[PDB]
Amino acid sequence: MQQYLRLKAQHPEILLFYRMGDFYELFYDDAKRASQLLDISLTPMAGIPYHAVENYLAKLVNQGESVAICERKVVRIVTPGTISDEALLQERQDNLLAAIWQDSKGFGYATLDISSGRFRLSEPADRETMAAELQRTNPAELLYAEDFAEMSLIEGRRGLRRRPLWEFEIDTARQQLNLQFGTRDLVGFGVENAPRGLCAAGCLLQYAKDTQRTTLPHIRSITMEREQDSIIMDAATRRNLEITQNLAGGAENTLASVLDCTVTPMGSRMLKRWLHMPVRDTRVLLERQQTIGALQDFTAGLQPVLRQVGDLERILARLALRTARPRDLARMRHAFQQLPELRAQLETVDSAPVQALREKMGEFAELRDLLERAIIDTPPVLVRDGGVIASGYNEELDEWRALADGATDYLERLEVRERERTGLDTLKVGFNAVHGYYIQISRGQSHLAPINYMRRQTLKNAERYIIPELKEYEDKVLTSKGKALALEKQLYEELFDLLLPHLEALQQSASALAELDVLVNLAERAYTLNYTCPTFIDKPGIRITEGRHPVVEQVLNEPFIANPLNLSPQRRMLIITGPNMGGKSTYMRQTALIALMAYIGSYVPAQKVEIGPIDRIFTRVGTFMVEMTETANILHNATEYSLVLMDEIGRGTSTYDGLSLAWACAENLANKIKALTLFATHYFELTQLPEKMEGVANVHLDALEHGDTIAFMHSVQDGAASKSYGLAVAALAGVPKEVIKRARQKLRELESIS
Amino acid sequence: SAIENFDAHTPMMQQYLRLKAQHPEILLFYRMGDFYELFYDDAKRASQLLDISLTKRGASAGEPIPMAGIPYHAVENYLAKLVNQGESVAICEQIGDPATSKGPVERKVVRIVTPGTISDEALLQERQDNLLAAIWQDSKGFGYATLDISSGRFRLSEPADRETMAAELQRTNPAELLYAEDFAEMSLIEGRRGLRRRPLWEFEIDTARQQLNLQFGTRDLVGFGVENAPRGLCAAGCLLQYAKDTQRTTLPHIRSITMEREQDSIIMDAATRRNLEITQNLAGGAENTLASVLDCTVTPMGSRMLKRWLHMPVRDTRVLLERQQTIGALQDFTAGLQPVLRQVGDLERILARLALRTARPRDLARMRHAFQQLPELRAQLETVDSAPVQALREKMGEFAELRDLLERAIIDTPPVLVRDGGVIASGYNEELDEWRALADGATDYLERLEVRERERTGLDTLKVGFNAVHGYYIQISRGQSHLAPINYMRRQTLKNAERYIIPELKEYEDKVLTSKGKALALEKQLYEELFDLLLPHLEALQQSASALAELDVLVNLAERAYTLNYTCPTFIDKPGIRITEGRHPVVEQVLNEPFIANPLNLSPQRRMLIITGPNMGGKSTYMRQTALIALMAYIGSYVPAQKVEIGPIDRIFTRVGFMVEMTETANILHNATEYSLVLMDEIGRGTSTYDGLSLAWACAENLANKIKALTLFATHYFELTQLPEKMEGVANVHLDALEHGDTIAFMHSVQDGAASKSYGLAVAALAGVPKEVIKRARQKLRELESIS
DNA sequence: AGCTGCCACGCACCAGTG
DNA sequence: ACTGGTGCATGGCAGCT
Numbered sequence A: 001m002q003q004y005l006r007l008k009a010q011h012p013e014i015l016l017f018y019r020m021g022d023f024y025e026l027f028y029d030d031a032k033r034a035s036q037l038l039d040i041s042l043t044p045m046a047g048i049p050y051h052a053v054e055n056y057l058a059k060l061v062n063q064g065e066s067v068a069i070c071e072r073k074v075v076r077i078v079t080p081g082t083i084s085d086e087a088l089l090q091e092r093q094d095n096l097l098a099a100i101w102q103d104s105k106g107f108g109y110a111t112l113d114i115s116s117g118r119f120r121l122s123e124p125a126d127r128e129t130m131a132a133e134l135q136r137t138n139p140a141e142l143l144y145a146e147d148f149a150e151m152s153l154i155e156g157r158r159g160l161r162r163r164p165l166w167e168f169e170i171d172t173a174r175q176q177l178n179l180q181f182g183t184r185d186l187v188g189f190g191v192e193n194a195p196r197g198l199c200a201a202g203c204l205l206q207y208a209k210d211t212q213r214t215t216l217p218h219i220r221s222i223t224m225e226r227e228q229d230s231i232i233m234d235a236a237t238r239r240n241l242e243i244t245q246n247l248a249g250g251a252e253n254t255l256a257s258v259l260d261c262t263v264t265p266m267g268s269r270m271l272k273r274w275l276h277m278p279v280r281d282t283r284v285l286l287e288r289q290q291t292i293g294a295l296q297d298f299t300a301g302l303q304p305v306l307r308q309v310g311d312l313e314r315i316l317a318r319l320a321l322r323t324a325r326p327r328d329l330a331r332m333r334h335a336f337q338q339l340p341e342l343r344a345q346l347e348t349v350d351s352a353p354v355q356a357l358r359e360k361m362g363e364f365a366e367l368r369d370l371l372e373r374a375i376i377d378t379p380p381v382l383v384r385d386g387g388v389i390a391s392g393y394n395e396e397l398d399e400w401r402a403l404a405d406g407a408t409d410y411l412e413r414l415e416v417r418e419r420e421r422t423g424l425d426t427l428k429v430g431f432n433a434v435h436g437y438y439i440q441i442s443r444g445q446s447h448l449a450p451i452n453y454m455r456r457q458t459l460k461n462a463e464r465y466i467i468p469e470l471k472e473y474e475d476k477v478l479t480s481k482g483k484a485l486a487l488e489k490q491l492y493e494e495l496f497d498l499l500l501p502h503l504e505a506l507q508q509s510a511s512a513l514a515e516l517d518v519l520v521n522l523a524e525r526a527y528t529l530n531y532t533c534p535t536f537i538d539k540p541g542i543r544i545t546e547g548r549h550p551v552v553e554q555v556l557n558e559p560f561i562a563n564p565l566n567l568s569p570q571r572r573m574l575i576i577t578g579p580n581m582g583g584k585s586t587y588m589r590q591t592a593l594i595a596l597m598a599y600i601g602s603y604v605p606a607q608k609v610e611i612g613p614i615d616r617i618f619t620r621v622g623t624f625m626v627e628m629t630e631t632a633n634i635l636h637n638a639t640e641y642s643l644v645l646m647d648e649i650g651r652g653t654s655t656y657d658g659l660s661l662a663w664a665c666a667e668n669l670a671n672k673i674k675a676l677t678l679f680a681t682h683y684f685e686l687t688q689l690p691e692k693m694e695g696v697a698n699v700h701l702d703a704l705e706h707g708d709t710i711a712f713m714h715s716v717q718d719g720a721a722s723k724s725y726g727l728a729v730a731a732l733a734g735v736p737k738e739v740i741k742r743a744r745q746k747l748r749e750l751e752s753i754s
Numbered sequence B: 001s002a003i004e005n006f007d008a009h010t011p012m013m014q015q016y017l018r019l020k021a022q023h024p025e026i027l028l029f030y031r032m033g034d035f036y037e038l039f040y041d042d043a044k045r046a047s048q049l050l051d052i053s054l055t056k057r058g059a060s061a062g063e064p065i066p067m068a069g070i071p072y073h074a075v076e077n078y079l080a081k082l083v084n085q086g087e088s089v090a091i092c093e094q095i096g097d098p099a100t101s102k103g104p105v106e107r108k109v110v111r112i113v114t115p116g117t118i119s120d121e122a123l124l125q126e127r128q129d130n131l132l133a134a135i136w137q138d139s140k141g142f143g144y145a146t147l148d149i150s151s152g153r154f155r156l157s158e159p160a161d162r163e164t165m166a167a168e169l170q171r172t173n174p175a176e177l178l179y180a181e182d183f184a185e186m187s188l189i190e191g192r193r194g195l196r197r198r199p200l201w202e203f204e205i206d207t208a209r210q211q212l213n214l215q216f217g218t219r220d221l222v223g224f225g226v227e228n229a230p231r232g233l234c235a236a237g238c239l240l241q242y243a244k245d246t247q248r249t250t251l252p253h254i255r256s257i258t259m260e261r262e263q264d265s266i267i268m269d270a271a272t273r274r275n276l277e278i279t280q281n282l283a284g285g286a287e288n289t290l291a292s293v294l295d296c297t298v299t300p301m302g303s304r305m306l307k308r309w310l311h312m313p314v315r316d317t318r319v320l321l322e323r324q325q326t327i328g329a330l331q332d333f334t335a336g337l338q339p340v341l342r343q344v345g346d347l348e349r350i351l352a353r354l355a356l357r358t359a360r361p362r363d364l365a366r367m368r369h370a371f372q373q374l375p376e377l378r379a380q381l382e383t384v385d386s387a388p389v390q391a392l393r394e395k396m397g398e399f400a401e402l403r404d405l406l407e408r409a410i411i412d413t414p415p416v417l418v419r420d421g422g423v424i425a426s427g428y429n430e431e432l433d434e435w436r437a438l439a440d441g442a443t444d445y446l447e448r449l450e451v452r453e454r455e456r457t458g459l460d461t462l463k464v465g466f467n468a469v470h471g472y473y474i475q476i477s478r479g480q481s482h483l484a485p486i487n488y489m490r491r492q493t494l495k496n497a498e499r500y501i502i503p504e505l506k507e508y509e510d511k512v513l514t515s516k517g518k519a520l521a522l523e524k525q526l527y528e529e530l531f532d533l534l535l536p537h538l539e540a541l542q543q544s545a546s547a548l549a550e551l552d553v554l555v556n557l558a559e560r561a562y563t564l565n566y567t568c569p570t571f572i573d574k575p576g577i578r579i580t581e582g583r584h585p586v587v588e589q590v591l592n593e594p595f596i597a598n599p600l601n602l603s604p605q606r607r608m609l610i611i612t613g614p615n616m617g618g619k620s621t622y623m624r625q626t627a628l629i630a631l632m633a634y635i636g637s638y639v640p641a642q643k644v645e646i647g648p649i650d651r652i653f654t655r656v657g658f659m660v661e662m663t664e665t666a667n668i669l670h671n672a673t674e675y676s677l678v679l680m681d682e683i684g685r686g687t688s689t690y691d692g693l694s695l696a697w698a699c700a701e702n703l704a705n706k707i708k709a710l711t712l713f714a715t716h717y718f719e720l721t722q723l724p725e726k727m728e729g730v731a732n733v734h735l736d737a738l739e740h741g742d743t744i745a746f747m748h749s750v751q752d753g754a755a756s757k758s759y760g761l762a763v764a765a766l767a768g769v770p771k772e773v774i775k776r777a778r779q780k781l782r783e784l785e786s787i788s
Numbered sequence C: 001a002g003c004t005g006c007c008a009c010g011c012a013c014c015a016g017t018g
Numbered sequence D: 001a002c003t004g005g006t007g008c009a010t011g012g013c014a015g016c017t
C-alpha cells in the first residue's frame, strides 16, 4: 500500500480514515491526534473497527473534527457543522454551523442548523457583542476569513475552518442566497440592507452545499437577530447564571434542568434557545403568558400525546436530504396519527395563538394513510434487505412474494419427502450464499445417501448435497425474492416523491409542535412550581414579593427563604452588606433569573413581579484583574435600563485601594449610569453612601447564633449589617482561643478610627 | 425468579454458583470450553461494559439464564477494558480433564484482576506507580499501608491526624484502597477510585502479625522497625491478605516492609503538594510540572523513583551528602552512561513478572538484554572516583551465569507467548530437538509425496494440503476426481475439489500431530523451568534493578545540574534559608524573557517576611521557588541558584486564597514547629472590612511570637507592613514595580522594606475601568490616606 | 482483497430408543 | 440410563467469489 498519501493531499486539514480490512487506519498527525481524542493505541498508525464507525465518527465530530472515509478514493466526509444522521447528534442539543468575518466597520455573523433549516444572521458592532454571540450560539464548526484580524475571539475553539476572502464576497453571496430561497430580492426576510452578515451567510451556505452535494430545500428563509430585540448578556453572565451549563462544565443544577420538562427533543432544543434569548418586546411576551395560562388545565391531556410525535424536526431534515430510513418514515407516520387527538384537545382552549398553533400543526391525513398502507408496523432499521413495504399496497409485489413463498413451501415439503423416502431422521434442507440450497444428511447417516445426491461440501459431522430438483426451486425463490426486493426499493423511493411536495407544510407542523411542547411545558412548570404571572411597567424597576431562586429552591432540600426586592428609579441601588456565604450571591442571581424568565414569557418564582424594560443583565458574581475587567465592562456599557449585579469588588487588593474602587463604582452606577444595581459589598464604610446620595439604600444579611454553630440566615432586611462573622467562623474551625482574642482586639482598633 | 435452590440448578450451575458466592460483588469470568462466560446480572453488566451481546442458556428451572462470553484467546483485550474502568474480575479456569470427569470439570478461581494488583505491561503505565493501599482508623489516629505489587515495595505509616492522612493519600495516590467498615472519616476516602469496603476482621492485629511474619519468614517484625506500629500493621495485614487473594501464588518479591516515620522526611500538606505542581499541574496534566523539567531519566523505573523522591524529601544528612557527591562525580559521565542505562529498561517490573511466574518470552529476552549491559556499565563506573557510585556498581551486580542461561535458552526475537511454542532454541534440550526434527519433517515428506502422487496418477491438479478440521489430505479437482485411484479414501469434499486420504499420509498425520504436541508440552516444561533456575537469585536481581533505577535518577540529576546550571546547596544546624540568585526551576524554563533571579534570607532572627507588591508582581513565584529549592535540596539534587544554604525543615505548609479556609489555618497553627517552612499566599477572609485582616494579623503574630516558624507571608493588606514594627522576627520585603503614569511595569525583583505604595488603582486602570471612575477613586483614596 | 458462515468447546436441551 | 444431534457468546480463517 504505497499509494495512499496521494489521497491525503486532496484535503490535508481533515483527518483521513483508511479501510484496511474490517477497520479504518490512520497515518502521521492523524494518528497522534486520533489517539489523543478517541483513546486508541499507536503502533505511526491507529485504527477503529468497522462495527462502530458511527460511534467513533461522532466523538471526533463532537470534538470539532471533520473525518474523511477512504475505501480507492474518498467516498464520505462528515463535518461537525453539517451532520444530520441521528447517530452523530446529541438528541437534546442544537448543532450549529457558523461563519464569522470582519469589515473595516464591523463583524458579520451567520448560524445554520442543518436539520431545522433555521438560518440566522447578525451584525455585531464591537467585539464584546460578538463574543456574547459565540458563547450563546456555540457552533460545532466555525468558518472564518484569513482576513480576520481579531483572532482572540475564536482562538481556542473547536471546529475552526479557515476560508479565503473571495468566499465572503457580497454580490456572489446575494445571488447564491436569492437562488436558494427562490426570491429576486431578500426583502421578505428582513436582511437586504445588512451586508456584513449577508457575506457570512454567503460563505456558510456555500460551505454547507459542498459538504452535502445535495439540495437543501428545507433551508427556505433567513432572519436577522437585532441587538435591541434582546436582553443582551455577556458570556461571563451566561456562565454565572448557569442558564444551560453549570460552571462545572455539565448540565446539572442549571436553569434548564429545572425548567425543561418538555416531552420531545425538538421542544427541548427550542426552550433552551428561548432561555438564552430573552426578547424585550412585551407583545410576544404577553402572548406567551396568556398561552401558558390557557394551557394549564390541558397539560396532563396534551403531553402523553405530544411525546408520541417525537423529533419530527430532525426526521424531516432526513426527508429533505433524501436519507430517511424506514423507521424515520414510520415515526413520521406515528406523529401524523397524534394530530387529530392534539387538534381535538386544543380546540376549546381560549387563546388566539394556541388555535394558531393548532392550524399550524396540520393534520396531513393523506400522508398518514399513505404510510399506514405503505409501511409495515415496525420496519427494519434499513431498506437494504427489504421487509419494509406493507402487504397489499402494490398488487405486483404481492404476486412476487407469493411466488417466493410458495417455492419456499415446496422446499419444506421436499425436506419431508426426502426424509420419508430415505428414512434418515437427520435429513434437512438448508440455505447458504456459498452453495445455494442443499440437502444435508449427517455424517453417521451420510453413507446411505441416495446415489442421485451430488456431493458439494463436507462438514465435520455432516455432508451436503444438491439435486436437480433442489436447484430448480433455488432459482424460483431467488428471482421472486430479487424482484420483490427491487420493487420495494423503488416503491420506497416513490414515498419520498409523495412526501417532499408537502415539505414546507411539514416543517411548519414540526415547528408548531415544537412550540406547543415548550408552551405546554412552561405552563406545567408554572402551575406545578407555584410561579405567578409577572406584569410589565413603563419606567424601569423590579418590584418582587416572596421571590426565590428557581433552581436552588428545587435542588437543595432545606426550606428556601424568600425575599422582596424594591428597585424603582427613586431607589435604584441596594448596598447589600453582611455575610455572603452564598446568601447575597443567591439573592442577586435570583433577581437576574426572575428578570430573565419574565422576558422569556414564562411565569416566575414569586408571589408578585412587576418589571420595567431591561436591555442588559450584568452579573459579576463568581484574579483581582478579571474582577476589574468584568467591572470595566459594566461601567462602559450599562444604561439606566440595565440590571447590574455586583459581588464584593475590592477583595484581592489593599483595603483602601479596594474601598476606593467600590465607592467610585457605586457612585458611578447610581449617579451617572443610573442602572438598577445590587451592589453587594463587605466594606462597612460604604453604608455611609445612602446619606451622601439620592437613590441608594442599605439592606443586609444577618446571622443568628445558637448552640455551638451559627445559622447564616438568608433574609435580606433594611439597614446596614451591624455585625461581622469571620472571627466567629474561625472559632468554630478551632483556631486557638488566644489567637481569636488578639484578633478581636485588633479588629476594634481598626474600626474605631473610621 | 423462581425458587432457585441448590437442587433446582443443573450440575453446571451448582458449581458456577458456589464459586460466584465466594465472589458475590465482582465480575466472574467462568471458563466453559473455549470461552470465558458470565451469568445473571454479570452478563447483563458485561454486555454494557464490554459491548458484547446479552444471550441466554436454555433451562428447565423456570426462566432462562442471562449469559455473555468471549473466546479465551481474546481475554486480555476485555480484561483491559474492565480494569481501566476500575472493575475487579475474578478469573476462573478449568483444572481437570473433561474426558476423565463424571460431572462438571473441576474449576478454581486462579487469579483476580483488580486495579491495584495488576502487574501486566499492558494495563500499567511505563512511568507511573500503581499502588495497592489500605487505610484504617482508630480512636486516636490512622493506619496506612501501600504496596507496589510489581516491585515488592511494602510501606507502613501511622499518620497522626486527619490532615496528614489527606496528604499521604494525595502523595501515594492508590489505584485501589481497601478500607475498614468502621471507618469514621469517610470525607478523606469517599470519592477516590478503587474503593473497597472490607470487614473489620481483616484489620485484626494478631492475624496481621502472624500473616506478615509468615510471609517474611520471621518470628517477629523487630528487624523491620514495625513491631511497635499496630495501627499500621492492621493496614498491612489487610493489604497482604488481599494481595494474596488476588494472586493465588507465592509472592517471593515481598520480602520486607518499612515504617515511614514522621521525621525521616519533609512532610507536605495537601495544599503544598498542589501549589508546587510537583508531578501534576493544577489542571491534572503533567505539562509544566517540576517533574516535567527534571525528569529526563532513561528507564521507566528511574522515572518513578525520581517522582517518589521529589514527593518525599529525606531529612537524613548522610544520604543527602552522598547523593550530592554522586551527582558531582557523575557529571562528566552522563553522556556515555545514559544511552547504555536506557537499554536496561524496566527490569523492576520484569522481575515482578518473574517473581509472579507470569513473565512471557519477551520479558525474559529484555532481562537477558539487561544483563548484557552490565559489563559496559561496570567498566564505565570504575573510573568514577566516588564511594556511593561504587556501592551502586557493586549492588548492580552482573549475573553472567543467567545471561548465559537466557542466551542459550531463548531465541533472539521470541513470540509474545509460549502458548504456541517457538520460544526455546536449538541446542538447549536434546529431547526437544529430536521432537521438532520429526515435526520438522517439512523440507521433506509432504513435497515429495505430492510430486510422486501427481506423477503416478497423471493428474496435474493434485496437491497435498492440511486443514485443521479434516486433517492432512490429497486434493484433486472435480474434473479430474473421477480418475483418482480406487485406493484413495474420500475425506473432504468441496465445491470444486475432492480431497482424499491414504494410509501413508494418515500414518504421517498421527506421527506429526503427536510429535508436535509432545514438542509443545516439553517446551512448556523447559520454559517454566527457567523460572525455577532464575528464582533463587531474585533478591540479588531486585537489588540490581533498584541500583539501576537509582543510577538512572542520579545520572539524570547530574545532567540536569549541568545543563540547567544548578549548584550544590549546603546544610546547617539551625533553621534558615539563604538563597543567592535563586530561581523558580520551572517558570524559568517555560518563559522566554530571562528569569529575574532573587535572594532570600531567612533565619531565627529574621524568620517572617511580609511580602508586598502588585498583582502580577512575582510574590507567589518567589514563594513557590523558595519551597521548591527546599524540596530539591532535600532530595539531594543540586539547586537553581548561585549559592543555597538551608537548615533543617520538618514540615512545609501552604494556604493559597470559609469553614474550610479557617480550618486549614488552624492546622498550620497547631502543627507548625520552629523548623517548619510556612507559605501563606494572601490569607485573611472576613465578612466585613477588617474582619479577615484582623485574623491574618493575629495569625502572623502567632507564627512569629509563639511558633517561631520560617514564614513567607504575601499580602495585599498594607496594614500588615506595620507588623515588623510590633513583632520581633518579622520584616518587610516587596516585589518592585515602576510608575510611568499611564502603564504597567513589573520589575520581578525582591528588595528589602515595604512597598512605597499599593497599586490597586493602577491595576484597575489596566483592566480598562473608565478613567472617569479611576479619577474619583484616587480622589477617595487621599481622603482615606489623610486619616493617619 | 472482501464476505459468509464453519468451527473452537464443554455443557445443557431435546428426541428417539433401551 | 442411553446414543445422537443439535445449538451457543466471539474471533480466526477456509472456502469461494
Ligand SMILES: Nc1ncnc2c1ncn2[C@@H]1O[C@H](COP(=O)(O)OP(=O)(O)O)[C@@H](O)[C@H]1O
Pocket (backbone or CB within 6 Å): B587, B591, B594, B595, B596, B597, B598, B613, B614, B615, B616, B617, B618, B619, B620, B621, B622, B748, B749
Ligand atoms: N522572578 C521572576 N522573573 C521573571 N518573571 C517572573 C518572576 N517572578 C514572577 N514572574 C512572572 O509573574 C507572573 C505572576 O507572578 P505572581 O507571583 O503570581 O504574582 P503575584 O505576586 O500577584 O502572585 C508569573 O506568571 C511569572 O511569569
Ligand SMILES: [Mg+2]
Pocket (backbone or CB within 6 Å): B619, B620, B681
Ligand atoms: Mg499570587
